[PDB]
């Protein structure tokens, strides 16, 4: 299967790397936004109002 698996393995690996690059961009973006929405702003609301 070496004539096939060699190419199939390389094909899959390149696809995985590209897709994971996209996922890393998305998570880097979401995390600061998620933290601000749920943690910092609620703290400001509590300190002023509660």
Short mmCIF file of N, CA and C in Angstrom, two decimals:
data_model
loop_
_atom_site.label_atom_id
_atom_site.label_comp_id
_atom_site.label_asym_id
_atom_site.label_seq_id
_atom_site.Cartn_x
_atom_site.Cartn_y
_atom_site.Cartn_z
N UNK A 1 0.82 -1.20 0.00
CA UNK A 1 0.00 0.00 0.00
C UNK A 1 0.86 1.26 0.00
N UNK A 2 2.18 1.08 0.11
CA UNK A 2 3.11 2.21 0.19
C UNK A 2 2.95 3.22 -0.94
N UNK A 3 2.78 2.82 -2.20
CA UNK A 3 2.57 3.82 -3.26
C UNK A 3 1.33 4.67 -3.04
N UNK A 4 0.33 4.16 -2.32
CA UNK A 4 -0.88 4.93 -2.04
C UNK A 4 -0.80 5.62 -0.68
N UNK A 5 -0.46 4.88 0.37
CA UNK A 5 -0.47 5.46 1.71
C UNK A 5 0.49 6.64 1.82
N UNK A 6 1.63 6.59 1.14
CA UNK A 6 2.56 7.71 1.20
C UNK A 6 1.89 8.99 0.74
N UNK A 7 1.19 8.94 -0.40
CA UNK A 7 0.53 10.13 -0.91
C UNK A 7 -0.69 10.49 -0.08
N UNK A 8 -1.49 9.50 0.31
CA UNK A 8 -2.67 9.79 1.11
C UNK A 8 -2.28 10.40 2.45
N UNK A 9 -1.23 9.87 3.09
CA UNK A 9 -0.81 10.41 4.38
C UNK A 9 -0.37 11.86 4.22
N UNK A 10 0.41 12.15 3.18
CA UNK A 10 0.85 13.52 2.96
C UNK A 10 -0.34 14.43 2.65
N UNK A 11 -1.28 13.95 1.84
CA UNK A 11 -2.45 14.76 1.50
C UNK A 11 -3.24 15.12 2.76
N UNK A 12 -3.50 14.13 3.61
CA UNK A 12 -4.25 14.40 4.83
C UNK A 12 -3.48 15.35 5.73
N UNK A 13 -2.17 15.14 5.88
CA UNK A 13 -1.41 15.96 6.81
C UNK A 13 -1.45 17.43 6.41
N UNK A 14 -1.30 17.72 5.12
CA UNK A 14 -1.36 19.11 4.68
C UNK A 14 -2.72 19.72 4.95
N UNK A 15 -3.80 18.98 4.69
CA UNK A 15 -5.13 19.49 4.98
C UNK A 15 -5.29 19.77 6.47
N UNK A 16 -4.80 18.87 7.32
CA UNK A 16 -4.96 19.06 8.76
C UNK A 16 -4.24 20.33 9.20
N UNK A 17 -3.02 20.55 8.71
CA UNK A 17 -2.28 21.74 9.12
C UNK A 17 -3.02 23.01 8.73
N UNK A 18 -3.54 23.07 7.51
CA UNK A 18 -4.25 24.27 7.06
C UNK A 18 -5.49 24.52 7.91
N UNK A 19 -6.30 23.49 8.13
CA UNK A 19 -7.51 23.68 8.92
C UNK A 19 -7.19 24.09 10.35
N UNK A 20 -6.15 23.48 10.95
CA UNK A 20 -5.79 23.85 12.31
C UNK A 20 -5.32 25.29 12.40
N UNK A 21 -4.71 25.81 11.33
CA UNK A 21 -4.34 27.22 11.32
C UNK A 21 -5.58 28.10 11.44
N UNK A 22 -6.65 27.73 10.74
CA UNK A 22 -7.90 28.48 10.85
C UNK A 22 -8.44 28.42 12.27
N UNK A 23 -8.44 27.23 12.88
CA UNK A 23 -9.00 27.09 14.21
C UNK A 23 -8.23 27.93 15.22
N UNK A 24 -6.90 27.98 15.07
CA UNK A 24 -6.11 28.79 15.99
C UNK A 24 -6.44 30.27 15.86
N UNK A 25 -6.66 30.75 14.64
CA UNK A 25 -7.08 32.14 14.47
C UNK A 25 -8.40 32.40 15.17
N UNK A 26 -9.36 31.49 15.02
CA UNK A 26 -10.67 31.69 15.62
C UNK A 26 -10.59 31.72 17.14
N UNK A 27 -9.84 30.79 17.73
CA UNK A 27 -9.80 30.72 19.19
C UNK A 27 -9.04 31.91 19.76
N UNK A 28 -7.96 32.33 19.10
CA UNK A 28 -7.25 33.52 19.56
C UNK A 28 -8.19 34.72 19.60
N UNK A 29 -9.07 34.83 18.61
CA UNK A 29 -9.99 35.97 18.55
C UNK A 29 -11.07 35.85 19.61
N UNK A 30 -11.66 34.66 19.77
CA UNK A 30 -12.80 34.52 20.66
C UNK A 30 -12.42 34.76 22.11
N UNK A 31 -11.25 34.28 22.53
CA UNK A 31 -10.94 34.25 23.96
C UNK A 31 -10.97 35.63 24.60
N UNK A 32 -10.25 36.63 24.10
CA UNK A 32 -10.36 37.96 24.72
C UNK A 32 -11.77 38.50 24.71
N UNK A 33 -12.52 38.28 23.63
CA UNK A 33 -13.90 38.74 23.59
C UNK A 33 -14.75 38.01 24.62
N UNK A 34 -14.59 36.69 24.73
CA UNK A 34 -15.36 35.93 25.71
C UNK A 34 -15.06 36.39 27.13
N UNK A 35 -13.78 36.63 27.43
CA UNK A 35 -13.41 37.06 28.77
C UNK A 35 -13.99 38.43 29.08
N UNK A 36 -13.89 39.36 28.13
CA UNK A 36 -14.42 40.70 28.36
C UNK A 36 -15.92 40.65 28.61
N UNK A 37 -16.65 39.88 27.81
CA UNK A 37 -18.10 39.87 27.91
C UNK A 37 -18.56 39.32 29.25
N UNK A 38 -17.90 38.27 29.74
CA UNK A 38 -18.41 37.51 30.87
C UNK A 38 -17.75 37.86 32.20
N UNK A 39 -16.53 38.40 32.18
CA UNK A 39 -15.76 38.61 33.41
C UNK A 39 -15.55 40.08 33.74
N UNK A 40 -14.94 40.85 32.85
CA UNK A 40 -14.57 42.22 33.18
C UNK A 40 -15.82 43.09 33.34
N UNK A 41 -16.71 43.06 32.34
CA UNK A 41 -17.86 43.96 32.36
C UNK A 41 -18.78 43.66 33.53
N UNK A 42 -19.04 42.38 33.82
CA UNK A 42 -19.86 42.06 34.98
C UNK A 42 -19.23 42.57 36.26
N UNK A 43 -17.90 42.55 36.35
CA UNK A 43 -17.22 43.10 37.52
C UNK A 43 -17.48 44.60 37.64
N UNK A 44 -17.40 45.33 36.53
CA UNK A 44 -17.69 46.76 36.57
C UNK A 44 -19.13 47.01 36.98
N UNK A 45 -20.07 46.21 36.46
CA UNK A 45 -21.46 46.39 36.85
C UNK A 45 -21.65 46.16 38.34
N UNK A 46 -21.04 45.10 38.88
CA UNK A 46 -21.19 44.81 40.30
C UNK A 46 -20.62 45.92 41.16
N UNK A 47 -19.43 46.41 40.83
CA UNK A 47 -18.75 47.37 41.70
C UNK A 47 -19.52 48.68 41.76
N UNK A 48 -20.14 49.09 40.65
CA UNK A 48 -20.88 50.35 40.64
C UNK A 48 -22.28 50.20 41.23
N UNK A 49 -22.95 49.08 40.95
CA UNK A 49 -24.37 48.95 41.24
C UNK A 49 -24.67 48.10 42.47
N UNK A 50 -23.82 47.14 42.81
CA UNK A 50 -24.12 46.18 43.86
C UNK A 50 -23.27 46.34 45.11
#
